[PDB]
Antibody, heavy 212, light 213 residues
Framework: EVQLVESGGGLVQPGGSLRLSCAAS????????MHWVRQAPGKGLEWVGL????????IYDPKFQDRATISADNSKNTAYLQMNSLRAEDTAVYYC??????????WGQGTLVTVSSASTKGPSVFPLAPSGGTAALGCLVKDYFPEPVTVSWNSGALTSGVHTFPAVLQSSGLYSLSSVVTVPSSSLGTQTYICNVNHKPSNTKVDKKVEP | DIQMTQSPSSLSASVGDRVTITCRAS??????LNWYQQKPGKAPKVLIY???SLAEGVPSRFSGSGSGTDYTLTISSLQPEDFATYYC?????????FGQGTKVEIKRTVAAPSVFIFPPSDEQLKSGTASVVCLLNNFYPREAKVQWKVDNALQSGNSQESVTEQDSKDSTYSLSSTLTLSKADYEKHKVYACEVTHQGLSSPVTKSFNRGE
């Protein structure tokens, strides 16, 4: 069971540095090339660079040659990417990937780095309460920064009928997002619905019961 | 660097249709060209490697062809789950470069939205703001219009909306619209409604509630 788990995402000030980790399990990074690829919100994939963990050789896209450093610690079986002098253009989801030579066969989950001078703010979570055979309920996650927020239902077991919408930037410069779930009208009285909201930047975890 | 240009940038086709996507490298890449599929919010997944080989676990409806500078990805019978953005990647020389991506949408039969309206929660009303939300659920095509009315008067400039990516199973879309008012204004007025127009609706559908009731 090969796994690549990334960490180090979040909010960074313009001119500051990102420091991401890609912890590997199920294989030895020493036997493969490990690469970093990023994707700015709504844009295409962009190659950052690679490292051969065996002897440490690296290759960077010329755009990052002067500001990025890819490295690896075999004893912790982890690859890292550090990039300094960050600007707005560096806001993106960064992925680490295992290269077999032929293709990338395993990927990290991806972590968003947001380059902004704005301050981190945790969201307020409010219920969207149900009013023929189908009803809908949901949660309004409001006034947070920076992205992202993850929303699940009944601790992630409920995915049927769930729709979590893209956040929108409000007039205040803070984000707002809603998640709804459609359900049998009859289930409103025979079962409870709970939305779970996680905003890592502000270490906020909220469980909100949504009742008619 | 080697520039990779994909064509077209987006396309839509029906379930069962054949889909073709091309990619041109600015110079010879000697078949070191892979195709990756990326669904919303997920890491890319390889489909084809070395221009023509099908990656393990990938459905046989996917195939790649080409050599030199020109490459083509073919999906023989498009399936709902094939909604995604497809990228070519040349790894013939550094820096490795990706095409800009080609977004593939599924074309399906018209489906009218199911509409729901939500008043602001009491918890939110403890503060200075009130949010009223309207949900347009599982409809197709993506185009839809929502207008808000407070005390039967059409509203302007105080709402924002967002739409989900096409559903991977039924190929529909959902949309959420939020009307924002001050808590003082919300408490002053009574009737709150959202009116929806869509290709699958012969006439507008309105959902509403009266504060208090």
């Amino acid at each position: 069971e090969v796994q690549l788990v990334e960490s180090g995402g979040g909010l960074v000030q313009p001119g500051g540095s990102l420091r991401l980790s890609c912890a590997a399990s199920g294989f030895n990074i020493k036997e493969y090339y490990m690469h970093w690829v990023r994707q700015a919100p709504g844009k295409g994939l962009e190659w950052v660079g690679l490292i051969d963990p065996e002897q440490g050789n690296t290759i960077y896209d010329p755009k990052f040659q002067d500001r990025a450093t890819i490295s690896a610690d075999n004893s912790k079986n982890t690859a890292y990417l550090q990039m300094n002098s960050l600007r707005a253009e560096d806001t993106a989801v960064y992925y680490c990937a295992r290269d077999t030579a032929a293709y990338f066969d395993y990927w990290g989950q991806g972590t968003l780095v947001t380059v902004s001078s704005a301050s981190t703010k945790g969201p307020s979570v409010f219920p969207l309460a149900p009013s023929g055979g189908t009803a809908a309920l949901g949660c309004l996650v409001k006034d947070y920064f920076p992205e992202p927020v993850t929303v699940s239902w009944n601790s992630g077991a409920l995915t049927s009928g769930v729709h979590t919408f893209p956040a929108v930037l409000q007039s205040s410069g803070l984000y707002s997002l809603s998640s709804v779930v459609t359900v049998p009208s009859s289930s409103l009285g025979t079962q409870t619905y709970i939305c779970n909201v996680n905003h890592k930047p502000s270490n906020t975890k909220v469980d909100k019961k949504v009742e008619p | 660097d080697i520039q990779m240009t994909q064509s077209p940038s987006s396309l839509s086709a029906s379930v069962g249709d054949r889909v073709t996507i091309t990619c041109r490298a600015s110079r010879d890449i000697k078949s070191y060209l892979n195709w990756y599929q990326q669904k919303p919010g997920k890491a890319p997944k390889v489909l084809i490697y070395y221009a023509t080989s099908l990656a393990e676990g990938v459905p046989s409806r996917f195939s790649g062809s080409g050599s030199g500078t020109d490459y083509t990805l073919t999906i023989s019978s498009l399936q709902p789950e094939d909604f995604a953005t497809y990228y070519c990647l040349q790894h013939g020389e550094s820096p490795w470069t990706f095409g800009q991506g080609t977004k593939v949408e599924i074309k399906r039969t018209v489906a009218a939205p199911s509409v729901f309206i939500f008043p602001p929660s009491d918890e939110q009303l403890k503060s200075g703001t009130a949010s009223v939300v309207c949900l347009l659920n599982n409809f197709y095509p993506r185009e839809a219009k929502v207008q808000w009315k407070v005390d039967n008067a059409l509203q302007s400039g105080n709402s924002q909306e967002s739409v989900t990516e096409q559903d991977s199973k039924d190929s529909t879309y959902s949309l959420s619209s939020t009307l924002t008012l001050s808590k003082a204004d919300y408490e002053k007025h009574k009737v709150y409604a959202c009116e929806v127009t869509h290709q699958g609706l012969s006439s507008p559908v309105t959902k509403s509630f009266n504060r208090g009731e």
